[PDB]
Amino acid sequence: PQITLWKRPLVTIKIGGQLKEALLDTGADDTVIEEMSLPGRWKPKMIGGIGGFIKVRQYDQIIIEIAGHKAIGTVLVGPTPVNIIGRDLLTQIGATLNF
Amino acid sequence: PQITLWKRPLVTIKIGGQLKEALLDTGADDTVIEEMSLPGRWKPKMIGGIGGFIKVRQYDQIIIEIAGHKAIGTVLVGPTPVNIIGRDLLTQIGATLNF
Ligand SMILES: COc1ccc(S(=O)(=O)N(C[C@H]2CCC(=O)N2)C[C@@H](O)[C@H](Cc2ccccc2)NC(=O)O[C@@H]2C[C@@H]3CCO[C@@H]3C2)cc1
Ligand SMILES: [Cl-]
Ligand SMILES: [Cl-]
Ligand code: NA
């Protein structure tokens, strides 16, 4: 698809067996999801942006289905105000910005 | 152009006759620039990012070039870690997300 940007580019994702709504975000290095359980090992991380930093749990090699496309990558889990699909997974589905 | 996302989608902008670097950010509703001087009056705005809410100065109808494309519109000035071009101005330069 071609997604215009008149509105927030929200898509449905499946992660950890759960459906969630998430923002396709070229300005995010990594994927950041609201509190949820994920399997396997993790390590703490601090990520920052407008308003400062939050503490997240970094899970690697997590499978996500993004608007019908499967991808594997890093997911950060923490108190994010919106679920964000970042560049680490956008690349895997071949997403580009065009103008 | 067609911009892949393996690295940050940074472009050159021109505002106030000055060249600056900015991030093309589909996850940003608004355009937010680091502290600079702009003409005219400003109005207050609060925006909420990953770490919480901040106060910014809103300047309207500002001429800005983005990657060689002219836009005219609202610019928020405040303590952002990086200059971000949000959907307000991405729509003006005809940007879309594609996969
Ligand atoms: C390491 O991975 C990440 C680190 C930080 C972020 S972020 O959410 O802080 N952010 C990074 C951007 C902003 C600074 C920078 O260098 N890159 C992703 C953004 O797209 C973010 C994504 C976002 C975070 C929180 C709420 C809504 C969207 N949007 C955002 O801050 O937009 C600002 C806030 C206002 C709300 C929406 O638009 C308005 C303008 C995401 C993943
Ligand atoms: Cl960060
Ligand atoms: Cl590619
Ligand atoms: Na893992």
What are the helix and strand counts (H, E) for chain A? 1, 9
* B64: enclosing H helix or E strand: strand B52-66
Residues of B in contact with A5 (CB under 8 A): 26, 87, 90-91, 95-97
Q: Cα A86 from chain centroid? A: 5
Query: What is the domain count for chain B?
Result: 1
Q: Whose CA is nearest to atom 20 of ligand 1?
A: B27
What are the helix and strand counts (H, E) for chain B? 1, 9
Rounded CA-CA distance A12/B84 in Å is 25
In chain B, which residue's Cα lies nearest the Cα of A84? Answer: B27
Q: Whose CA is nearest to atom 6 of ligand 1?
A: A28
Q: Residue B5's closest CA among A76, A35, A97?
A: A97
Rounded CA-CA distance B81/A28 in Å is 13
Q: Residue B82's closest CA among B3, B27, B39?
A: B27
> What is the CATH classification number for the domain harbouring A94?
2.40.70.10
| 3-state secondary structure (DSSP) of residue A96 | strand
State which residues form the domain around A44.
Answer: 1-99
Resolution value in angstroms: 1.5
